[PDB]
Amino acid sequence: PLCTLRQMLGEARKHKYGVGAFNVNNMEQIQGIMKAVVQLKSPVILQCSRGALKYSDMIYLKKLCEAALEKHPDIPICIHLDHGDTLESVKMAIDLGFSSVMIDASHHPFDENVRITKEVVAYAHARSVSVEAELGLTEPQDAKKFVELTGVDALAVAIGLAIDRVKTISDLTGIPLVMHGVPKDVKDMINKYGGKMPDAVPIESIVHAIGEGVCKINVDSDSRMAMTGAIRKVFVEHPEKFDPRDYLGPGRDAITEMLIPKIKAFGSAGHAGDYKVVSLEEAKAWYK
């Protein structure tokens, strides 16, 4: 059922596991993600940026998310606006039926980040909708003050040695923390088949951080790369094929295969049935 971020991450915090939050932009991406979380009976957060909403003209993505919610009634599913920039973007998402939003004003000075975030929280909490915010190396007492002044349900913090910082931020704020954004397999495949990926690019570190309070792990690039590597492989190996199902299907399955190990490591496997999901309407009571 549609689930709030507050309830889904509160459960993860209480049982020391993290939930993957996967950016989705079209049908094959949502299908690849849901096959993994359903196979591992894990809750999931589907997230969409304002750009993803533009790409799908808003309505197509809303309807694909309704499809997931209907096809897998027993999986807690949070639909979340990633990297929201303004109250106007938040209103737009809540209107589409989202159950959570991120208001990212972390590039602003502290007081202005608080001002903008507070306004979003008032609007969202009145509808039962959860709010994630960010504060950007983060003094734990500054994190505590920010959460006190704003009332956000979750806090993305600048992470990095200092794992007791994560622990301290989690203990002082008392709320779920979020960790924002590269497999050899995917990387090698893309280059093998014509790609030119940056020389950029550790799971253990993420596991370590979950144990101290990180409850939401954002994954976007990895899925994009899995799909692209799979399509490039079909294009080289079978150049006569032109039906999109012939390369998007393999791309959809690469996403699922790349996600299974991650979900297992984050620890949310098996937890989908742990709690009765609270509706947005019943959630309004949490905020009085």
Contact window for its own copies (CB under 8 A) among 14-22, 80-88, 226-234, 269-277: 226-234
Contact window for its own copies (CB under 8 A) among 13-21, 37-45, 50-58, 124-132: 50-58
CB of 270 to its own copies, least distance (A): 23
Tokens of 116: 């903008």
Say how far residue 121 (Cα) sits from the centre of its chain: 19
**Residue 225 binds its own copies (CB under 8 A):** yes
**Residue 231 binds its own copies (CB under 8 A):** yes
Known binder of ligand: residue 50? no
**Residue 29 binds its own copies (CB under 8 A):** yes
Contacting its own copies within 52-81 (CB under 8 A): 52, 55-57, 59-60, 62-64, 66-67, 70-71
Contacting Zn ion within 162-181 (CB under 5 A): 180
Q: Is 111 a catalytic residue?
A: no
* Residue keyed to tokens 């144990």: 211
Q: Which amino acid is at 275?
A: Y
Residues that contact its own copies, how many (by CB under 8 A): 46
Rounded Cα–Cα distance for residues 121 and 132 (Å)? 9
Identify the CA nearest to 50 among candidates 4, 8, 6, 101. 101
**Residue 198 binds its own copies (CB under 8 A):** yes
Rounded Cα–Cα distance for residues 5 and 212 (Å)? 19
CB of 67 to its own copies, least distance (A): 4
* Interacting residue with its own copies among 15, 208, 245, 279 (CB under 8 A): 245
Q: Angle at Cα 104 formed by Cα 101 and Cα 106, nearest 5°?
A: 155
**Residue 242 binds its own copies (CB under 8 A):** yes
Residues whose CB falls within 8 Å of the CB of residue 8, separated by 6 or more in sequence, listed in order: 19, 43, 45, 76, 78
**Residue 192 binds its own copies (CB under 8 A):** no
Are the CB atoms for 251 and 28 separated by under 8 Å? yes
- Contact partner at residue 232 from Zn ion, its own copies, none, CB < 5 to 8 Å by partner kind: its own copies
For Zn ion, the closer CB: 81 or 147? 81
44, 99, 117, 222, 276 from 225: Cα distances, Å: 20, 28, 32, 5, 35
Rounded Cα–Cα distance for residues 91 and 93 (Å)? 5
For its own copies, the closer CB: 71 or 208? 71
> Which one is catalytic: 57, 82, 153, 222?
82
* Residue keyed to tokens 């989690």: 170
Q: Which amino acid is at 26?
A: N
Residue 156, classed as helix, strand or coil, is strand
What residues make contact with its own copies under the rule CB under 8 A?
25-31, 51-52, 55-57, 59-60, 62-64, 66-67, 70-71, 190, 194-198, 221, 224-225, 227-228, 231-232, 235-236, 239-245, 248-249, 251
Please give the positions annotated as active site: 82
